[PDB]
Assembly symmetry: C5
Homo-oligomer: 256 residues x 5
């Protein structure tokens, strides 16, 4: 049912841009929450990364992956604005003559900046719990944040592609089912996949660098490196979202 799906997608895009043109406050607040949601998932899996790494476990990355489902499940189940997901919706709705190229440009920028705000808000709050004053978890953040800002642009860009392919395909999946359960399971599988395989998610990283740059202990990485990671991964996501999933669902769901 590609036609029915492409239509759903396009409506989604129109609804998004409509919200933005109606209330920037509403759209920013909705995106803020999606960032805090994806971020919560990060906090869970780095807390797991810490516990399991300190204990020298081979299962660390598998378990970290199995436990990330909450990040996207919360976003999908609350109907909040996540930038990575708008990479497919805006483009798919754009090729379908439902939204302009500006519309897409505007939703991407606002959803992005909006997601960042949720991540910064979460960062400060977590930091204030003490839970990263020192120890295995605190360190797991510092090291990870360093690893990522230290990788080749090509490596990130491509990691970013494979990631948003998985994310958007689970979003597409939710558009093609009525089972909120099936929705969640598919999100579970895709995040399990993208997390454990080592792909890069622009928004989830906002929480990673948010907590680092806001933590006292963490001296390891600069703000300039956080921008290099987000930009290289962002571009990667955009490609994997718009140029693969966006264009793909349109091609499969046109009618002449």
């Amino acid at each position: 049912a590609h036609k029915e799906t492409l239509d759903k997608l396009t409506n989604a895009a129109i609804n998004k841009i409509n919200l933005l043109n109606t209330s920037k406050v509403k759209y920013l607040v909705s995106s803020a929450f999606a960032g805090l949601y994806v971020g919560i998932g990060i906090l869970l899996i780095f807390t797991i990364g810490g516990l399991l790494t300190d204990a020298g476990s081979p299962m660390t990355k598998i378990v970290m992956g199995l436990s990330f489902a909450i990040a996207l499940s919360l976003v999908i189940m609350t109907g909040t604005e996540l930038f990575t997901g708008n990479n497919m919706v805006m483009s798919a709705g754009m090729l379908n003559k439902g939204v302009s190229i500006k519309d897409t440009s505007k939703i991407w920028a606002y959803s992005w900046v909006g997601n960042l705000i949720g991540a910064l808000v979460l960062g400060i709050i977590f930091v204030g719990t003490g839970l990263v004053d020192k120890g295995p978890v605190a360190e797991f953040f510092a090291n990870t944040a360093a690893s990522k800002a230290s990788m080749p642009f090509t490596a990130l860009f491509f990691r970013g592609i494979l990631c948003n392919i998985l994310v958007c395909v689970s979003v597409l999946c939710s558009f093609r089912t009525n089972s909120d359960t099936a929705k969640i399971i598919m999100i579970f599988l895709c995040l399990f996949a993208f997390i454990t395989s080592g792909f890069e998610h622009s928004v989830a990283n906002m929480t990673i660098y948010s907590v680092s740059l806001f933590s006292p202990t963490i001296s390891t990485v600069t703000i300039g490196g956080a921008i290099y990671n987000l930009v290289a991964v962002t571009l990667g996501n955009i490609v994997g979202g718009a140029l693969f999933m966006g264009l793909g669902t349109y091609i499969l769901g046109k009618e002449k």
Copy 2:
């Protein structure tokens, strides 16, 4: 995107609460009691696990603990009973939405809080009578955890409670946005897995923690003035996460003019 339809569902839920309180206090407390005892049953389970595993020196203890805490909020959702931390978002949202007053909110918060506590007290007492926390790893787990929580800076507890309710209320929010019960349970399971393992603080869960520690004859790491210090700051944290975050969010996203 179905925010108006939901903010409505919320604003209605808020009304039914203050309505229930106003027609029968026996009914509102007895409900709040079963909720506290339900959230507490969840603490009995994961603290038993917390004990078996720490005594064995496993690195998976906090992970397995968070995973098993699902029963706490699941019972409360599936029975439709009054939980204080859940009303932080409902009453809050229903208030901003011109459905209930500030007086109603603080009435429901108080009666459900004091109500949940009765649930904990009854549970703890009964749990002690089972003899399961006379001695051993579990007793030691309650004893040690009770002390760690009572001896943390105010700010730490405060923020730990904020992140907790954002998760607890959001799982509730999810339940107002789906007709699948299975979907409801899963999301609760995920949100609880997150807040437990991440090390966040839930006031009504702590009532069973302190209920059991203080009531146990052999567990003295406690201090009632300590349990109060915790329950107050964590509760403050929960209200800020439930009302100022989720409550205010569900409304800002739900209005129309």
Copy 3:
């Protein structure tokens, strides 16, 4: 929604006493099965107890509790007469003016005996499988039946209270959801909670003592010690089922 549920419970209660006043065969044959169904859960988690204990792992209690779900899941899905569950139904239905004190006591007695007959039959058959001729499993039974029969009264009594709160609250959930899957998930969590936490269920114990008594491989049993545990635990279940859940569901769901 408590009016509908309380009404719903009262109807269940009235059906039970109707079935018993209509056919004692049907009601004992339905109780025997519910006993033998819960008993099956025991045979599983004790076979699991023998293997994990003999090997001495910490997870033993946790795995056992996660595996007991089948016990009450068969009872609910087959729709058969479990004594512990009748503590809430008959209790609430009675308070709601639908059933009489005499009706409650009959349904309580007849399902108890019936459940027991259920376990006796399971025991004999299990004994004949040889699965308990000697080794970890038969040892886990022997060892477990001892401690249960050597615990102070109040301990069992309270343990029985907490058990039937969980067992009945899962039964309650199966009255508040149209999703059969959601039913099974809730039973799962409740049975996981009460098993791993070390609470006492009377019907399940009939199977424990059924095997320990029929198996040649002795025990620190002595029947008299089995009647002591079954009597003290049953009273606990009754209090937890009737006084807590039964009366609780009534108070929340009356109308004036």
Copy 4:
């Protein structure tokens, strides 16, 4: 509600026999598929039993049980003819005046033989894969076949009884719910129990022996010993299925 189920069963029995009298091809082809489907489950959990026993694991049997769900999940979800299941269905239908005693015997004889053809075909093909040319799995196969063909008749008979009580009770559940998801979860719990507990399924054993015999590695099997196990368990199965489940479902769901 039991006549509404007892009715479903009686209709299921009438349709089974209607199929046999309409196409001995269709009924066999269906039974051979059920047999092969169940065997497929065996191939998985013996591949597991081989991996885990070799490494000396205390979890071996527990993981085996947890993974055997696929066996009956294909037979129920595809609607194919399984002998063990026909014990309760044909039995209950025969007691409810739906089908005759000769009807019950044809269905039983054919489905049984049909299931064997499935196992044989699967057995052959599996051997051709080379996965039993030598090693842990092959050893687990030949080892388990022996132990089974070496146990007293009684043991097998009683194991067969408890095995079918469980396999049939899950088949009953699938008659008592409209949730396909629920149907599966229940099959999962029932097989988990009977596998891990130590009970004997006659059709699953066909594949166990199919492989052991057709397998290039000597044996220690003796085909005359394989028949001993299949007769012992099959009879155990019949009792468990017919006398217990069949008779119980009829008794609980009559109308006078």
Copy 5:
């Protein structure tokens, strides 16, 4: 309920060829995603194999099977064209007189070549991430591709069969249920069964070899060996898929 299913199947077949006859771009792009989706499943379970292998674990093969569901799940939920699935559909469709032999061979050819386009695309992108420049994963990819290539034709062939009997029987299931969750669960089981059992999947192998050839690590892969495996496995699938499931779902479902 096979008539209705055979009808449903014959319809899928008619739609597939219709799609191909109406737009080669739509069809190939649809097959490109199916291959890439199945490939993502491989990327996941080889990342898992690399980690657990390097840590020397006996559970590795078991954890790989449990984590492969995302492969056929993404495909069934996006409604995309996977060659191994068309072995059954086109077979049953043909025998039921909905499509021709020419129609069949076109669908087979185009999906297979379409799936390969997807493998090659996933390959390039994945290697571009550095996640296989060197290490346990990279070495795992290399090592598995070598084993597969260096295996007798008869072995690969028979494993291709059993693999597709499961891949297809899961597609058959998705045709028989309306529970989307039940569809995923059943796929999860079937992919668990064939991965852990050690069976051979043509399309999954496409990404294995796609990554082993673009990958920097030197090994014993040999292109002539990749074609030898792809061919001998492809065949195996065609047989188990068409000669087994196709013909079976036809025989059980025709009407006279």
